[PDB]
RNA sequence: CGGGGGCAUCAGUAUUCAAUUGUCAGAGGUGAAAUUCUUGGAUUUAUUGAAGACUAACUACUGCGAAAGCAUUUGCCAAGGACGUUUUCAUUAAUCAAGAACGAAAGUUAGGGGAUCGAAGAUGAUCAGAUACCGUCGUAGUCUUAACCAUAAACUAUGCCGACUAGGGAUCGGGUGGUGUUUUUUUAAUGACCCACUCGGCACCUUACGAGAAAUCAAAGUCUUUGGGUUCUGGGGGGAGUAU
């Protein structure tokens, strides 16, 4: 979203992340389990935001049988772990640091390094993060991100 | 003359050694002997009268003021309640929803008692008789037997 | 098939059947005596224990119950008798 | 099987052949009867006593090492309860479902399950009345059962 | 090197809308739809009308100053077909042959987590 | 005719014969 | 014995008023003339005195409530709303 | 008599499956009965890809696709798609092609 | 459960029900534990906690009213406080109770 | 272990409406049109909001439930089958006139809600006519709370309990075994997987010993070589589920 304009130069701030539907649509393949988890949570400077996640079970590379679904308590366990990791990574310092997490996607690495003792769990992403409360305009904190 | 019960609530006078009895409308759930907390920094319990700026959105209050200081105007017959649906913290205002469904923006310093007003569900019982309508309007005014203007 | 000894079945065909569906039914479960190396005395734990059987002197743990066989708690030494 | 379901599950204990010995077995019948009485002091049903003797000590069946089953050892030592254990736990289940149904009146599933539990209770009570371990015209009434359990 | 727009092709059946906007999505340049280039009311969705509409839209876009575009093909969606009409392909090609540059193409059909009852009755739109 | 439209017609017959017989109770 | 079949308490009205009007009265006159459990002493002594007023016999506490029942269906969910909204404040 | 052992389709162990709508006529058909095919196609057709990949910065960039699952009724799938009508012995087959 | 633990003290231990017999056993130093029902009046609960701290007795609070505390002691009346005079072979003293 | 139930909670886009923005002649809808909405800028675009319903994709010859039925999250509440078991009681069981609980949709009563679709109704075409199909608008209804109703092609058109008879490989839930794979921390440990077996499910495939009037059927077999226990129903088609 475009926050401040200084003379034919209109400056912006992070307003959200979302997938393109061809990428999100190509991952939902049949004969596996889809896992969705979201958390509505605050940040250091008070950006209240809802950050989503997705995961999919996969085959081990010795598995013969067709599908490899989870078992519906593995889903609850993985959702618990995902939500705890997200509400750990948020309420670190603010969405400057959260976008500097989301760009190299370290969140997926933490998810797959925590849930691997539950289920194999391929193709993990963050898939969205949407703003539902901005604290204040705070022009100095804005221009801290425009050198 | 009224369907809702009333509650005598006694308070300590802050400036003189005496007691001040006020007559609230009894919200549903209150009982004699309960401590009622009136003020800005009071808690969100049933019976406590709070300003509307200090309650979250979706709080169900009754006996809510219109102007801050007019001691109770809206949602005041039996069973009724307003819903605080939103805040505008600058120019501090509060959008509430009146019992007629009409939305209304009012001051965030106007007060109201949490809960709905007792005696509710009163009009679900048929009067069945002209005697009950007689004794109903006997303590209100004089307009019971209103002959149709066409006759 | 069409001629077999149903009175003397082979042991490999009998060790695989359900414990009720063998020729004379008998339990596939056992007992075992356990000593925790802190104490000295031994105690007799069922294989399918269902309780947190603690040692006699130091009440700590010897087996946590599970779906089937009990799990001996990783510092143990057991003999099937 | 399953008088009040449609399940056909065969899951039970396969009692061994030998009606004597553990010849790996220690201390004799007086001590395991003493243990039975000691556990029955603690408020244990014979099912729980037999479980606790089976796993903690090595006691295969109390009818094998001792002379009788655990209800005769409880009853001959003045410790058998007023109503039998299975009727007790059925009445306990009916009391718990009735508390849930006064909390959750919209639940038709608990209504159906409560009718199944009480219809089980009445068949057990008719049996125990016929064999006369219960007095005649003993009646499970749904009001006093909550105290009758405890 | 370029300066981008976003092309917002919505090709249903019964019509095809080209219309480019600014990269913000607020300010629109060059609207022309597919049924403005024929008046025969059946060929509003036909790909020749989509080609003619996209050619006019590319002419006005090249005039205003937009030299590249970020297309977002769309179908009706919602409780409707979620399949683009016949004039969505050709318009795209007629937007790329003209001299407009193409970047970052995707598909933005609005798809529910399913929702409100689909029109047509329970036995369906039978005929 | 289709059996539920004879069933609906029969219910319309019975609803009439309940009405004419109600006038003479 | 069982004295009336279906009129119950509303047999005092006799043959008058219309049966569907005496059915809606019977739904509420059973509720307003019944004894309810006291929340405070745990005894079944709470009787209505006037519309919206419910007094307990022993421990003598008078609780405000619905006109024909102690707790209406509207005000019960209100008490659990404000219960929910308050614990979003202390947490 | 019975024309299929699996009568309409694929309901053994339920009693009720929640229905979907046909994509063509909006006839409401059960989800297991319907007829279900996933259409996976590019947003460009096989002629347009040359002229489009000429007309792009970021060379060829994705060839991005399009995915939707089509549920037909028995009428409108016979009327176009998956029909012909199979003989009594060729009916029992379940290999797709 | 806690209700299983109380059921053994009724059948194998010594106890007193009611308020006036409970605060008597506080005054004699004969109480081991008092279980107060939830719907007791707060003033009665305040002195029963005060009579305990003068005798260094532990107070347990029941999770229910006086109707269901009298149920756990196996009686058809309602008790407001039960005072354990003597743990028998039960284990209310050695548990969190 | 499960999409079994109840209550609360949470989310998701979409649809409809509304607010502001941008641009300019159409937009809908169809086999083709017309009614309809459009300088009151409709349709289209972007930001935000409200409302109610629904819970897509994952979603299958897969799960749970007595059936009807049940698919977002989380918490609480009670329940259940299967498995495991050298725990207990010891015939307590099977099926059931009368009787009882539950029972899709529509419908009924009284509030709440009313976005969408939409019996009636009003309209535009079609047509010889069109009280229809197709198009637009829309009432009750759809949703919920308290109470009725007690019917469905409520279907597997196949009562329930028990035993025996045939070959196969898949799958779901539980369990047992493996000097098997994977996850490294350094060996482990668990989970996932693989192999073999095992109960208990939803099913499937090939045969036919057997049955059948045949279609077809591992039950619809173990029936003129007729008897395991038990409940309900039928007796040419109508009249007629009519009259009383």
Whether E62 contacts E100, CB under 8 Å: yes
The DSSP-derived string for H19-71 is EEE-TTT--EEETTTS-EEEEEEESS-TTHHHHHHHTBSSSSTT--EEEEEEE
> Interhelix angle for D46-55 vs D29-41, to 10°?
130
Instruction: Show which subunits contact B, needing at least 3 CB pairs below 8 angstroms.
Output: G
What's the half-sphere exposure (Cβ side, CA atoms, 13 Å) at H22? 24
The answer to whether residue D102 sits within a structural domain is: yes
Minimum CA–CA partner of H71 in chain E? E81
**Nearest C-alpha in D relative to C48:** D55
CB-based touch E/I (3+ pairs, under 8 A): no
Phi first, then psi: give them for residue B88, nearest 5 degrees: -125, 95
Judgement on whether residues D72 and D85 belong to the same structural domain of the protein = no
Chains D and G touch (3+ CB pairs under 8 A): no
Same domain, D74 and D90: no
Question: Same domain for D55 and D85?
Answer: no
Q: Do I65 and G42 touch (CB under 8 A)?
A: yes
User: Are D74 and D82 contacting, i.e. CB atoms less than 8 angstroms apart?
Assistant: no
Which residues neighbour E38 within 8 Å (Cβ) at sequence distance 6 or greater?
E44, E46, E48, E49, E52
Alpha-carbon distances, residue I78 vs G41, H8, I39, I44 (angstroms): 10, 62, 11, 16
Same domain assignment for residues D88 and D150: yes
d(CA E32, CA C12): 82
C-beta contacts of D123-129 below 8 A and 24+ residues apart: D124/D86, D124/D87, D124/D90, D125/D87, D128/D84, D128/D87
Q: Which bases of chain J come closer than 7 Å to a protein CB?
A: 1-16, 21-34, 43-47, 49, 51-75, 77-95, 101-103, 109-110, 113, 115-119, 133-136, 145-146, 156-158, 160-162, 167, 170-177, 180-183, 190-206, 214-217, 220, 241-244
Count the helices and strands in chain G (H runs, E runs): 2, 4
Cβ-Cβ contacts under 8 Å, H62 against chain A: 22
- Structural domains of chain I in order of their starting residue, each with its CATH number: 1-97 (3.30.1330.30)
Nearest partner of A81 among A39, A40, A31, A48, judged by Cα: A39
Q: How far apart are CA I13 and CA I87, in angstroms?
A: 5
* DSSP character string of chain C: --S--SSS--HHHHSSS-TTSSSS---S--EEEE--TTSS--EEEETT--S-B--SSS-S-SEE--SSS-EE-SS--EE--
Strand C31-34 relative to strand C78-79, pairing: antiparallel
User: Is residue D1 in a domain?
Assistant: no
**Interchain CB distance below 8 Å, G81 and B3:** no
Give DSSP secondary structure letters for B77-146.
STT--EEEEEEETGGGEEEEE-TTS-EEEEETT-EEEES-BSS-SGGGS---SHHHHHHHHTTT-S-SS-
**Quick check: B25 and B6 in contact, CB under 8 A?**
yes
Q: Where are the alpha helices (DSSP H) in D1-150?
A: 29-41, 46-55, 62-65, 70-76, 85-103, 108-130, 145-149
Closest residue to J59 by CA to C1' distance? A30
- Please name the method used to determine this structure: cryo-EM
The answer to whether the CB of E68 falls within 8 A of the CB of E43 is: no
Residues D137 and D116 both lie in one domain: yes
Distance (Å) of CA H60 to CA E5, E104, H21, H46, H49: 19, 10, 37, 14, 9
Any idea what the Cα angle at residue A31 is, between residues A26 and A36, rounded to 5°?
A: 65
Tell me, yes or no, whether D57 and D91 share the same domain: no
Phi, psi of D117 (to 5 degrees): -70, -45
Over its C-alpha atoms, chain D yields an Rg (Å, rounded) of 19
State the Cα–Cα distance between residues E86 and E79, nearest whole angstrom.
19
Same domain, yes or no: D52 and D113: no
Q: Which of D63, D80, D97 is the last residue of a domain?
A: D80
Partnered with residue G47 across adjacent β-strands are G55
Between CA A19 and CA G39 the distance in angstroms is: 55
Other CB atoms within 10 A of residue D140 CB: 18
| Other C-beta atoms lying within 10 Å of the C-beta of residue I66 | 21
Three-state SS at D48: helix
Which token pair is D45? 């049903």
Distance (Å, whole) CA C22 – CA C6 = 11
Which domain-ending residue is among D59, D80, D101? D80
Residue D129 exposure: Cα atoms within 13 Å on the Cβ side: 12
DSSP state of I57: P
Helix (H) or strand (E) holding B6: strand B6-12
Q: Do C26 and D14 touch (CB under 8 A)?
A: yes
How far is the C-alpha of A88 from the C-alpha of B63, rounded, in Å? 43
Q: Which residue has the tokens 């539990």?
A: D117
In a domain, D10, yes or no: no
Nearest Cα to Cα of residue D99 among D112, D110, D85 = D110
Q: Identify all chain I residues contacting G41, using CB atoms and an 8 Å cutoff.
A: 39, 66
Domain boundary among D80, D107, D124: D80
Supply φ then ψ for residue E4, to 5 degrees.
Answer: -100, 155
Q: Is residue D118 part of a domain?
A: yes
Distance CA C32, CA C80 (A): 4
CB E76 within 8 A of CB E16: no
In degrees rounded to 5, what are phi and psi of residue B106?
-135, 175
Alpha-carbon distance of D64 to D19, in angstroms, equals 6
- Which residue, A32, A104, A99, A29, is CA-closest to A70? A32
Token pair, residue E49, equals 């009308």
D51, D113: one domain: no
Give the three-class secondary structure for E80.
Answer: coil
What is the DSSP pairing of strand A48-56 with strand A122-125? antiparallel
Residue partners of E96: CB distance under 8 A and separation at least 6: E102, H48, H51, H52, H54, H55, H56
For strand J, is any atom closer than 7 Å to the CB of A20?
no
- H or E, element range at G22: helix G19-32
Count Cβ atoms within 10 A of the Cβ of residue E9 and give its class: 0-12 exposed, 13-18 middle, 19 or more buried: buried
Q: Would you call I12 and D41 a contact, using CB atoms and an 8 Å cutoff?
A: yes
- H/E stretch holding F6 reads helix F3-22
CA–CA distance, H45 with D17 (Å, rounded to integer)? 77
Q: How many CB atoms lie within 10 A of CB B32?
A: 14
Nearest CA in chain I to G38: I39
Give the resolution value in Å: 3.3
HSE-up of residue D28 (Cα within 13 Å, Cβ side): 0
DSSP one-letter string for E85-123: -GGGHHHHHHHHSSS-EE---EE-----SS-SPPSS-SS
Element (H, E) at G29: helix G19-32
Does an H or E element contain E58, and which? Answer: helix E47-64
* Residue I36 φ/ψ, nearest 5 degrees: -100, 140
Domain extent at residue D126: 81-150
* Chain centroid to CA E106: 12
| Rounded distance between C-alpha atoms, residue G51 and residue B2, angstroms | 10
Residue D38 maps to a domain: yes
Query: How far, CA to CA in Å, does H20 sit from each of E115, H4, H31, H68?
Result: 12, 22, 5, 14
Categorise residue D60: left if φ over 0, alpha if ψ from -120 to 50, beta otherwise.
alpha
Please check whether residue D52 lies inside any domain of the structure. Answer: yes
Alpha helix locations (H) across B6-102?
none
Assigned domain for D51 exists: yes
Give CA–CA dist E61/E17, Å, rounded: 15
Q: Exposure of C61 by Cβ count < 10 A (0-12 exposed, 13-18 middle, 19+ buried)?
A: middle
3-state secondary structure chain A: CEEEECCCCEEECCCEEECCHHHHHHHCCCCCCEEEEEEEECCCCCCEEEEEEEEECCCCCCCCCCCCCCCCCHHHHHHHHHHHHHHHHECECCHHHHHHHHCCCHHHHHHHHHHHHCCCCEEEECCEEEEEECCCCCHHHHHCCCC
Measured CA angle at A17 (ends A11, A20), to 5 deg = 120
In order, the DSSP letters of I3-42 are HHHHHHHHHHSEEEESHHHHHHHHHTT--SEEEE-TTS-H
Going from the C-alpha of A43 to that of each of C19, D46, E25, E82, the distances in angstroms are 60, 58, 29, 38
Q: Which residues contact residue A61 at a Cβ distance below 8 angstroms, ignoring those fewer than 6 apart?
A: none
Distance CA I59, CA I39 (A): 15
The answer to whether residues D91 and D70 belong to one domain is no
Residues D62, D85 within the same domain = no
**Cα–Cα distance between B103 and B84 in angstroms, integer?**
10
Q: DSSP assignment, residue D55? A: H
- Looking at CA atoms only, how far is residue B140 from chain G in angstroms? 16
Round to whole Å and give the CA distance between E28 and E37.
20
Please give residues of chain D from 108 to 137 whose alpha-adjacent beta carbon (CB) lies under 7 Å from any atom of strand J: 108-113, 115, 117, 123-124, 127, 131
Distance, in Å, from the CA atom of A62 to the CA atom of A41, rounded to the nearest integer, reads 40
Provide the 8-state DSSP code for I94.
T
Alpha-carbon distances of H52 from A58, D133, E30, E98, H40, rounded to whole Å: 36, 91, 21, 11, 20
Q: Which residue has the tokens 């409780």?
A: E79
Round the CA-based radius of gyration of chain G to a whole number and report it: 18
Three-state DSSP at E72 gives strand
Query: How many Å apart are CA B117 and CA B29, to the nearest integer?
Result: 9
* Mutation site for H-interface testing, chosen from E92, E111, E112 by largest number of H Cβ within 10 Å: E92
**Residues, chain D, total?**
150
CA-based nearest residue to D11, from C48, C28, C20: C20
Total structural domains within chain D: 2
D128 in the same domain as D115? yes
Phi first, then psi: what are they for A141, rounded to 5°?
-70, -25
Whether D56 and D98 share a structural domain? no
Contact B40, B51 (CB under 8 A): yes
Does residue D39 fall inside a structural domain? yes
Nearest to A107 by CA among A69, A55, A70, A145: A55
* G59 in B contact zone (CB under 8 Å): no
Chain E contact present for A22, CB below 8 A: yes
Q: Spell H69-80 as b/e; 16+ CB within 10 A means b.
A: ebbbbbebbeee
Tokens read off for A28: 């939902």
Record: contact C50-D58, CB cut-off 8 A = no
Q: How many beta-carbon pairs under 8 angstroms link D with I?
A: 25
């Amino acid at each position: 979203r475009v926050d401040e304009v200084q003379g034919k130069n209109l400056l912006t701030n992070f307003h959200g992340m979302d997938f393109t539907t061809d990428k999100l649509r190509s991952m939902v393949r049949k004969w596996q389990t889809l896992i969705e988890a979201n958390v509505t949570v605050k940040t250091s400077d008070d950006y209240v935001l809802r950050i989503f996640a997705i995961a999919f079970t996969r085959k081990q590379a010795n598995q013969v049988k067709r599908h490899s679904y989870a078992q519906s308590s593995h889903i609850r366990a993985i959702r618990k772990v995902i939500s705890e990791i997200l509400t750990k990574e948020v309420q670190g310092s603010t969405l400057a640091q959260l976008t500097s997490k989301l760009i190299p996607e370290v969140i997926n690495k933490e998810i797959e390094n925590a849930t691997k003792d539950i289920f194999p769990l391929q193709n993990i992403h963050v898939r969205k993060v949407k703003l539902l409360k901005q604290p204040k305009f705070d022009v100095g904190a804005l221009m801290a991100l425009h050198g | 003359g009224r369907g809702a019960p009333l509650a005598k609530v006694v308070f300590r006078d802050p400036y003189k050694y005496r007691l001040r009895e006020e007559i609230f409308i009894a919200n549903e759930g209150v009982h004699t002997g309960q401590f009622i907390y009136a003020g800005k920094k009071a808690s969100l319990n049933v019976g406590n009268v709070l300003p509307l700026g200090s309650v979250p959105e979706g709080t169900i209050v009754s006996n809510v003021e219109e102007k801050p200081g007019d001691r109770g105007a809206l949602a005041r017959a039996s069973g009724n309640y307003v819903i605080i649906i939103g805040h505008n913290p600058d120019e501090n205002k509060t959008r509430v929803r009146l019992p007629s469904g009409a939305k209304k923006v009012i001051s965030s310093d106007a007060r109201g008692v949490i809960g709905v007003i007792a005696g509710g569900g009163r009009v679900d019982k048929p009067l069945l008789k002209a005697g009950r309508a007689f004794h109903k309007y006997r303590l209100k005014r004089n307009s019971w037997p209103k002959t149709r203007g066409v006759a | 098939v069409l001629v077999q000894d149903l009175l003397h079945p082979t042991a490999a065909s009998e060790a695989r059947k359900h414990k009720l569906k063998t020729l004379v039914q008998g339990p596939r479960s056992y007992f075992l005596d356990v000593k925790c190396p802190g104490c000295l005395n031994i105690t007799t734990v069922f294989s399918h224990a269902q309780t947190a059987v603690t040692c006699e002197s130091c009440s700590t743990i010897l087996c946590t119950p599970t779906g089937g066989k009990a799990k001996l708690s990783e510092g143990t030494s057991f003999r099937r008798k | 099987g399953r008088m009040h379901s449609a399940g056909k599950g065969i899951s039970s204990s396969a009692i061994p052949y030998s009606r004597n010995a553990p010849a790996w077995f220690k201390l004799s019948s007086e001590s395991v009867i003493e243990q039975i009485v000691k556990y029955a002091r603690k408020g244990l049903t014979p099912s729980q006593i037999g479980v606790l003797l089976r796993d903690a000590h090595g006691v295969t069946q109390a009818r094998v090492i001792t002379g009788n089953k655990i209800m005769r050892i409880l009853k001959s030592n003045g410790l058998a309860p007023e109503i039998p254990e299975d009727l007790y736990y059925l009445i306990k289940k009916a009391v718990s479902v009735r508390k849930h149904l006064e909390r959750n009146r919209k639940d038709k599933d608990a209504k159906f399950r409560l009718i199944l539990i009480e219809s089980r209770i009445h068949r057990l009570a008719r049996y125990y009345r016929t064999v006369a371990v219960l007095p005649p015209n003993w009646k499970y009434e749904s009001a006093t059962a909550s105290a009758l359990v405890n | 090197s370029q300066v981008f727009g976003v092309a917002r092709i919505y090709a249903s059946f019964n019509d095809t809308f080209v219309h480019v906007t600014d990269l913000s999505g607020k300010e629109t340049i060059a609207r022309v739809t597919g049924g403005m280039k024929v008046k025969a009311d059946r060929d509003e969705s036909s790909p020749y009308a989509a080609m003619l509409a996209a050619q006019d839209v590319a002419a006005k876009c090249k005039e205003v100053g937009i030299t590249a575009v970020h297309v977002k093909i769309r179908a009706t969606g919602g409780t409707r077909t979620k399949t683009p009409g016949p004039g969505g392909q050709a318009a795209l090609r007629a937007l790329a042959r003209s001299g407009l540059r193409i970047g970052r193409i995707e598909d933005v059909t609005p798809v529910p987590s399913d929702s409100t009852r689909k029109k047509g009755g329970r036995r369906g739109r039978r005929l | 005719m289709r059996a539920k439209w004879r069933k609906k017609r029969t219910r319309r017959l019975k609803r009439k014969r309940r009405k004419v017989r109600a006038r003479s109770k | 014995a069982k004295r009336t079949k279906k009129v119950g308490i509303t047999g005092k009205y006799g043959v008058r008023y219309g049966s569907s009007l005496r059915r809606q009265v019977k739904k509420l006159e059973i509720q307003q003339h019944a004894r309810y459990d006291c929340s405070f002493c745990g005894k079944k002594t709470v009787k209505r005195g006037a519309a919206g007023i419910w007094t307990c016999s022993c421990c003598k506490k008078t609780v405000a409530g619905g006109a024909y029942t102690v707790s209406t269906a509207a005000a019960a969910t209100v008490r659990s709303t404000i219960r929910r909204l308050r614990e979003m404040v202390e947490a | 008599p019975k024309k299929r052992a699996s009568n309409g389709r694929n309901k053994k162990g339920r009693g009720h499956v929640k229905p979907v709508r046909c994509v063509n006529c909006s006839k409401s058909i059960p989800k297991d009965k319907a007829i279900k095919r996933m259409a996976i196609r590019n947003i460009v057709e096989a002629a347009a890809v040359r002229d489009l990949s000429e007309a792009s910065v970021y060379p060829e960039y994705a060839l991005p696709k399009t995915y939707n699952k089509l549920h037909y009724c028995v009428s409108c799938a016979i009327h176009a798609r998956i029909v012909r009508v199979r003989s009594r012995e060729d009916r029992k087959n379940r290999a797709p092609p | 459960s806690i209700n299983q633990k109380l059921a053994l003290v009724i059948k194998s231990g010594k106890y007193t029900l009611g308020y006036k017999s409970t605060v008597k056993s506080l005054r004699q130093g004969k109480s081991k534990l008092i279980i107060i029902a939830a719907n007791t009046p707060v003033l009665r609960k305040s002195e029963l906690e005060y009579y305990a701290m003068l005798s260094k007795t532990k107070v347990y609070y029941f999770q229910g009213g006086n109707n269901e505390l009298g149920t756990a002691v196996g009686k058809l009346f309602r008790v407001g406080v039960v005072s354990i005079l003597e743990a028998g072979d039960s284990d209310i003293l050695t548990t969190l109770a």
